[PDB]
Amino acid sequence: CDDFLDRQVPQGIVTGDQIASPEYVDNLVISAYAIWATGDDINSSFSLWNYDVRSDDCYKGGSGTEDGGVFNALEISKGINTTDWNINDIWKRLYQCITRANTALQSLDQMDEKTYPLKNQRIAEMRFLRGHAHFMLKQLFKKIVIVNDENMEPDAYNELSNTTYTNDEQWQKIADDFQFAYDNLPEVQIEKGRPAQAAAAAYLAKTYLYKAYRQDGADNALTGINEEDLKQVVKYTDPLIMAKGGYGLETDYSMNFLPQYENGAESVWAIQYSINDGTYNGNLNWGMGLTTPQILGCCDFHKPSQNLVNAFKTDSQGKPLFSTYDNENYEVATDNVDPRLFHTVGMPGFPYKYNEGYIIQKNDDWSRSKGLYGYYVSLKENVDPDCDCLKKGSYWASSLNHIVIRYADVLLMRAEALIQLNDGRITDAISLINEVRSRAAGSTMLIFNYKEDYGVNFKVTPYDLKAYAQDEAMKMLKWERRVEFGMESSRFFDLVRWGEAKDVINAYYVTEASRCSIYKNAGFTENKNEYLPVPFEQISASNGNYTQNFGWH
Amino acid sequence: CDDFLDRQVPQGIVTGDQIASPEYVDNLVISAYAIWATGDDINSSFSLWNYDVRSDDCYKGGSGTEDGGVFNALEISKGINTTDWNINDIWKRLYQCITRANTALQSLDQMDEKTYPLKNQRIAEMRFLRGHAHFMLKQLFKKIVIVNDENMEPDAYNELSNTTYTNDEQWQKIADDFQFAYDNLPEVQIEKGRPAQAAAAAYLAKTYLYKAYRQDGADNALTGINEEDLKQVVKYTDPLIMAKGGYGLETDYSMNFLPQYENGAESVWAIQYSINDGTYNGNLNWGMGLTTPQILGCCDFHKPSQNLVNAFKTDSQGKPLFSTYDNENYEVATDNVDPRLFHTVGMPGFPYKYNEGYIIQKNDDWSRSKGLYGYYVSLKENVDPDCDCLKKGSYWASSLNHIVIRYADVLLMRAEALIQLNDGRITDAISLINEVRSRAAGSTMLIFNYKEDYGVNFKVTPYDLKAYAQDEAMKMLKWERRVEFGMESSRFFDLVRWGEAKDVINAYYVTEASRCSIYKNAGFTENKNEYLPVPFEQISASNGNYTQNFGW
Amino acid sequence: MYQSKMNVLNTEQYGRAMWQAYVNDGENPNGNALGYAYNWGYNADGNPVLYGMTLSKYLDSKNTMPVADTDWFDEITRTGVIQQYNLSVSNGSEKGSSFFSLGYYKNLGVIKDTDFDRFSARMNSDYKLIDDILTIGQHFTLNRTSEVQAPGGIIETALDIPSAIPVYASDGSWGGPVGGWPDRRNPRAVLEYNKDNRYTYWRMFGDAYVNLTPFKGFNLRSTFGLDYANKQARYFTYPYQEGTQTNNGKSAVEAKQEHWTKWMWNAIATYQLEVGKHRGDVMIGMELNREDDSHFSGYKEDFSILTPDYMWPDAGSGTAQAYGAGEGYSLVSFFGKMNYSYADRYLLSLTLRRDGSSRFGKNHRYATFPSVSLGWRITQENFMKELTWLDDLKLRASWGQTGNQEISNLARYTIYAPNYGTTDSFGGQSYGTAYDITGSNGGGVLPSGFKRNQIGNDNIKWETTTQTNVGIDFSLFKQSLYGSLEYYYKKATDILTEMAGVGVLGEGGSRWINSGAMKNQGFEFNLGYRNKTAFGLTYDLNGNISTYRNEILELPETVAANGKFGGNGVKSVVGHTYGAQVGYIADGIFKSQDEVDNHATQEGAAVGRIRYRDIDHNGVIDERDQNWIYDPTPSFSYGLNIYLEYKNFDLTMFWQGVQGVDIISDVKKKSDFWSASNVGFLNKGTRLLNAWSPTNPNSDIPALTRSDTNNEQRVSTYFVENGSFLKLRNIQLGYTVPAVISKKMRMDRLRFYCSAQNLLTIKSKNFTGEDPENPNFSYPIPVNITFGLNIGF
Amino acid sequence: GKSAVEAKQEHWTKWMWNAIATYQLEVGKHRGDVMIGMELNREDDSHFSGYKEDFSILTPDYMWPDAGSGTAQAYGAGEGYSLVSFFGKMNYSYADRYL
Ligand SMILES: [Mg+2]
Ligand SMILES: [Mg+2]
Ligand SMILES: [Mg+2]
Ligand SMILES: [Mg+2]
User: Fold this and answer.
1) What residue numbers of A does the annotated binding site for Mg(2+) cover?
2) Which domains does chain B have, with CATH numbers?
3) How many CB atoms are closer than 10 A to CB A210?
C-alpha cells in the first residue's frame, strides 16, 4: 500500500527542487533585498548603531545601566563575554542575509543569457549585496568566514574556516564582489532600490580604504598603509564615474534625513523602508525602535554624547577647535557653531526634528533615565511626531530610508586617500573637504530662524587653498568626517581603521566620566577590543575550524 | 423568559438610533461623498454620458443597434418607453445620493457648534452635494421632486410631489443650496475632494443660467430669457472670487483629462477616483467601463460623431467654419484644425491617448461593430493603456478624476450671460471667449510632433475685440462650448437650455444619416423629447401624486 | 439525463436569422459585425431571398478562433449517475431498544465538472430505568457532505453563447468570443475553472430525553436537542484570457467558513383519563428555541503556483480582504391541548398557544393562537348501524389560528452598515462609503462611512392566519372504499412582507411591513378503491382532486399602487388574485400596410409588427390601454396513485397534473425575437426561424428586426400561454423473491425494482415549450431511471 | 489606538481503517493465538484566518470583519500524513506454565 503514502503533498510551498526554476529567479532577487528591511531586530539593527556606542559619539540610553546590560558592557569596554547573546545574534543575522543572495545567485547562474539578458546585471546586484553583508561582518569581527561559493552544498558549510584567507586576502574577497558589481551594473537604476554602477564603485573604494590600513600582523595594530590600495580608492571615487549616475551633494544637509527627500542625488544606495504596502505593518525601519525619544513613551536609546555636541563648536574664522573643543560645554549664546549640529543632535530648548510644537526639555518626558544618560536626542533616524510616515508596532518606526552610501562619503573617502598618498595631491583633497564644509555652512533651510529665536551663531568656513602638512590635513579630514557623519555609526570603525581606537576611546572615557558616570570604570584594551569576539556559540559549533580574535584567549 | 428573546443583538452594524451620534457625523459626511464614486453603474454613470448619445456629439457604439437597445432608442429619439429600466435606474440612483447628504445634514443640524466648530462648513458640503444631484435630475427630467427637508420621516415621502414647485421655483430650490454653500464654505480646501467657495459660486452660476432660459408654459419651449437671473450668473462668475482659490486655466488643454495632472488649477471640483486604497479593486471610475476601446477586449461605446469631428475644422484665418464645417469630412492633409480635436477624439492613423505605440486603426481591433458606428474613440475619460492607474474589474476602469466643473466652463458661462444680457459689456464677453480660445491655440504639448509626422495644420485664433451683434456673439459662444466641451456630456443639455433642441438634432439627424445608418429613421418630437419621461414605476408608486412631463 | 431543452440556432441558422433581420430593416446584410457573407437578392416580387452563406474558417483576421458549430448544451452536460446504499439494524429488548444506520450517497451531476456525496450515521436508543416509570433516551444523526456546485445559471449561459464560438481555440487554449461577438465567456471553460471549488459540510443533530410517569396516566417529560452544522470551502480564481474575456491575470483564493448552531428545549406534562364512556387528554408545556449562525472568510490575491495545493492564503503575495458577520434569533412557546370523547361517537379538541419571537418589539413579541375542532363518528350512532356496508363516516369541523414570524432577523431595525467597499460587484455599484477626500489618488486607507441598508418598523407584528375546515371521512364495503371530502377557508391578517421603498426615499428604503389580508378557499376530494380479483391481482387506487380560489382583500394604497401583489402599478389587485398581472393584449401581427392604417395610431406599428388592440376605444394606444391578462390560479389540480401486485410482480405509479392554468414567461423573448434583450448578438431560440416575412406570412411570430421599436417586450398576452399538463411523477416495477426461498439464504424480503422519475409530461398545444410548471426555465427537469434492491432479514 | 479582530478557524480530520484475522487453538495442555492484519491511517488538517482593523464600535458584537474599515490580512494553510501498518502475533503455552 504505496500509492497511499505518496498522495498527500506539501501545502503552500515551493520545494527546493523547483526553486532553481527560471520563473522564480527574480523572486529570489527581490527576496534578497528585503531581509535588509526585514531580518534585523531592535537589539541588532543593520545600521550597526548598537555597536557604535563604543565610540565617542553616543551613549546607550534607557532606564539605566540595567536596561540593555550587554550593550553597556560594550560602551565601557568592560564585561564583554564571548558568549553574550547579542554578538552571536548579529553574526547569525548578517549571515542570514548572505543566504538569500547566494540562493539567488545559485539559480541565476543556470539562466540562459539568450532567454534572460538581465542575467549579469542581477548577478551584479546579488554579488553587491553579498559584499554589503561581508563588509559589515569584517567591520564587526575582522576574522570572518568568506561565504561566496554559492554552489556549496549545505554540509560543506561545516568545514568552512575564518582563517582560510589572510586579512588582506579577506578584504580582497569583499572587494572582488563590489569589483564585479561595478563592471556589470547599469549606470542608472530607474527602480531606486537597486544599486547603480556608481554605488558599487563607491562601495569598491570604501572597501579598499579599509583594506589599505593594513593589519598584516598577528594583532590588530597597523602594519602599514598600502599605496596600491589607496590608488584604487581614488580610482573608484572619480567624479566622472559619479557623474554618470547623477549623484552629488544635496542643497541642504537635512535633506538626507527627511522623508520628503528620499532617494535624492546623495542617496547613492539606500534601504527602501515603506509603509502602506500589504505587509502586517511595515516595511518600516523597525531596527531603530529603541532610539525613539521618551516623548513617544519609549525608549530613549542611542543618545548623542557631549563629546559630539562640543565637536560642532567653531572659532571666529568658522573653523573647528582642534585642540580646545571639549574643555567647556557648548554655550548657545557665546560660541560659534556648525549648522550640522542641529540636524544631528536635538538639544533641550530646541525644536525636536524641526517641529516647534515639541520643545525638548529636561524632564520625564524626554529622558527615561532622569539625566543619567543626558538630554540629547538623535535626529537622523527619528522623524516629525506629526509624520504620516510613523506607525506604532512593537516599537515605533518610520519608513524613512537608510542611506548606506551618502555621497559626502564618496568625497571624504577620496580626500583621505589623497592625503595619505601624500603624492602632492593634498590641495585637491582640501578642495573636496571644502565642498562638504561649504555645503554645511549654508545648510540652514528649517533652522534659519534659530539665530533670533534661540540665539545661535552659525559660522562655518572652508579652508584656504594653501600648502598643508600630511599630519595636519589628516586632522582636517578626520574632523570633517566627525561632524558630517555624527551618530551615523561609521565612527568607531573609522578609529579602528586609523589605528587610533585605544588612544581616542580611553581619552574620551576620561574626559567624559565627569559628565556621564557610567564611563567611570571604563577601559579599552589595545589589541583586543578593536573588534568583537568571534561568537562562542559559533566557534564551539565549528568543532575546531574557527579561530578566535587576538586578545580573547 | 422575556430576557431570553432580548439577549441577541444585531451584529456588525450600527442601529438607527445611534447614527445621530456626534462621533459618527464625519463618517456620514464622507459617506455622502463616496456614493458619487460607488453609486453608479456601467449603464448609468454620474457623468450622464449615456444620455448624451442624444446629442450630435456621439454615437452609442457597441456590437450594433441591438447591443444596448434602450440607448439606441435614446440616440434616435424613437422607441423611448415610459417603462424603460435605464431611465428608472438613473432616477433612483441619483436620489440615493441625496439620502446620504440628507442623513449627514440630519446629524449636522443637531451638532453643537461650541465643540464641533466646522458645523456650518460641513453643512455646506452636504447642501453643495445635494444640489449636485437635483441639478442633474433637473437636466434629465425637468419635473423633479425637491428633497430638502432632511427631517422628513420616511413615511412622509409617499406624499411628495414633483409639482409642489413651479418649474422656476425648482431651479430656485436648487440654487438655494449652492447659495448656502457659497456663504459658508471656506475659500481653500486642503482636501481637494471637498468643494471650495469658488466651486459653489460656479455651481450657483451654472444653476441660475439654466434657470434664465425660462420654460414657464406647460410645454418645454422658451418663454423669454430672464435678466435678473442672467445678472446673478455674472455676480458669481466674478473673477475676483475665483482668484481667492487659485483657480484658473491650465497651460495645456490635455492636462485636465490626465492622471499626472489630477487636481490642478482648473479642477474646480472633481469626484476623486482613487486606487490602491484597500477596496476590492479600487474606487475606480467603473461607470465608464463601456467607453474603453475594443483593444482592451471591450466595449467601444461613446464613439465620437463625425459632426463633432468636423466641427474642429477651421478656416484660413483660424476661426470655425460656422456655415460650411459639415459639408466635407475633415481631411488631415489640407484643412486647418483646432488642436482640441486631438484631446477629444482619437482618430485612425493617430495614437490612442498619446501612446504612439498604439495606433488607432479601422479593424476588428478598434471598432467592435465593423464600422456601423465609426472608428473614433473617446479620449477624455479613457487613459494611457500602459498606465499604472488602470485595472480590470467586471469591465475596465481607471483612477482618472471626473471634473464636474472645469474653469473653462466658469468663463464661457460668464460670456454667455453677458451676451444674452446685451448691455455694452458684450465686448468683455468676447475677451472671455478669447481666454479659452487662446489657451487652446497653444495646447500642443504632447502633440507638437504631429505637424511633421502626420501632416496636421493647427490654426486657432482669438476674435477681434470689435463690435459684434448679439445673435453673432451667441454664434461664437455656442461654438467655443462645442469645441471646448466635446464628449463631456454637456452638449445636448445645452441645446435644450437654448430651446433649439428640436432644430439642431433633427438637422444633425439628416446630415449625419448618410454616414451612420442607425440615425436613418431618427426624429425628435418638439415639446416632448427635451426631457426624459418621469419613470413609469416612480409615477405609479406615488399613487397619483406625481405628474408626467409634457408630450408623454 | 436531460431529455429536452430549448433548441437554439445552429451556426448555419444564426446567419440566416441575422440576414433576415438586416434586410427586414433595409440595411445591407453584408455589413454585419460578425460576417457572415451572403449572396442574396430579390425574387421577381420585390422581396429578398437568401441564396447562400459563407463564413471564413476563423472568426478573426488573425486565425486564433476557428469557426465551430458548438452544441453548447451537449458540451456542458453529462449523463448523470447516482449510486446509494443504506444498511440499518435495530434491536428491541424490553428494558430498552437501540438502532444504528450507515449509508452513502454519491452523485455525478448532470452538469459536467460537478459532483456530490453524503455519508450518514444514525444511532438512537432508549432505556427503561424503572419498569414503567422512568424511560431515558437519545436520538443522534451525523452527516458529512461534499459537493462542487454548478455556477450560477450556466445552462442559461450556455444557451446564449453563439454556436459560432468554438470550444477550443486554434492552439488548444479555451476558445471564446472575438471581436463583436457577445461578451459571454466559454461555459465549458467556466466549469473547469470551477472544478476545485469544493465545500465540506458536517452536521450533528439529535436530542436526549427523560420521561417520568409519576403514576397512572400522568407523565411529564423534557427533551433537549442540538443541531450543529459547519461548512468550509476554498474558491479559486485562476487567470483566463479566452478571446476578449480577460481577467487580466488575476489569481485569488477565498477560504470561507460557515457555522449554524440551533438548540431547543421543551418540557411537557400530559394527564389522560378513561371512565367507561368517557375519554380525556390534557397536555401542557413549553419549548425554547435558539439559533446563532455566523460566517467569515479570508481572501488573498496573486499566487506563484496555480494549483489548490499551493493556493492557500499564506502563500499569497498580493492584497487581501477579510469578510464575516453573524446573526440569530430565539423563539419561546407555551401551549395546551384538550381532548375529549363521549363513548367513541362525539369527539372534541381545543388547543391554545402563546408564541414569542426575537424578531419583534415587545409591544408585539408574543401572540396567542387558539384552535377548536370537533367530529362526530356517525356510523357509531346506533340508528345508523343497520346499513352495515357503510364501514365508517365522521363529520369533522375545525377552526384555528396560526402565526408566521418567518422574516428577517433584523426586520424591526433601521440598519446602518459601515460597508467600506471590500467586496466584489458588477459594473460598479460598490455603494462603498469610502472616498479619497484628500485627492491623493489613494495608496492608503481611505476614510470610511456608514450607509443605510434598511428602515425599521417598530410596530411590526405577527402574520396571523385564520383557518376553518369541515370534512366528511367515509369508508365502505369492508374497508374497500375509503375517502374524504373537506373544504377550507384560510384568511391571513397583517401579511408579513419586505417592501421595497419609494424611489425618492433613496438608499435602503426597503422595510418589513404588514400589508393587509388575503383569502384562500376550496375543496379537496380523496377516493381509494382497494380490492383483489378472482385471478389473484391485488389493486389499490387512491386519487385526489382539489380546487381553490384566491382573493386579495385589503392593502395599503402605496402597496396596491406599486404592483407587488400586484397589478403592475396600472391597476390595484384588491378583489383579484395574488399574482394577477395587468398588461397589453396582442392580436396577432400586421399582415400588410393596410391593417396598419386600419388600426389605432400605434407608435411603432409597421408591417409584420405586433398589433395591440385598443381598449381605450379612443383610437390611440398610449398606456391606459391595458387590462388583466394573467391569472395563476388553476381550474383544478388532481393526482392519482396506482399500486398493483400480481404473481410477485409489484407495479406502482403516481400521476399528478393540473388543468386550465395561465402561465407567463420570458423564454419567448429569447425564442421569438432577435432584439428582445439588452445585449447584442446572443444566441436565440430555434423558433424565430419561422417569423413573419414578405416571403412567409400568416405566422403568429413577429418579423425579425435589429431593434425593438414597437416595444414588443411590454407586458402583453404574447407571453401568456396555457400551462395545462399531466405529469407522471414516478413509475416503479418490482419483483419480490418468494419468501419460501428468500429464506433459504437467511433473508425474508428480497426484492429488485426498476424505476423512473419525470419520465413523461402531457402538455398543451398552446405552450411554447419545456416545463409548464417551471415556465421561466429554458430547460426541463432531468429524467431519472433507477435499478435497485431491498434485503429483509 | 489600534482596533482589530482575527477570525481564526481550525480543522483536524483523522480516519482509520483496519482488518484483523485471529485464529486461536487449545489442544488440552497446549494453547495458541495467532493474529494477522493491517491498518491504514490518514490525517489531513487545515486552518485559516481573517484579520481586519479599525472599528467604530469596540464591542464584540460590532467587531466582525464585515464591519471593519482599516486594512485586512488573510492567513491559512494545511498539512497531512498517512501511515500503513502490517502486523502479526504469536502466543503459546502448555497450560499456564511456560509461555
Ligand atoms: Mg561610547
Ligand atoms: Mg522609503
Ligand atoms: Mg446622437
Ligand atoms: Mg483620482
Assistant:
1) 53, 55, 262, 273, 399, 401, 519
2) 1-552 (1.25.40.390)
3) 20
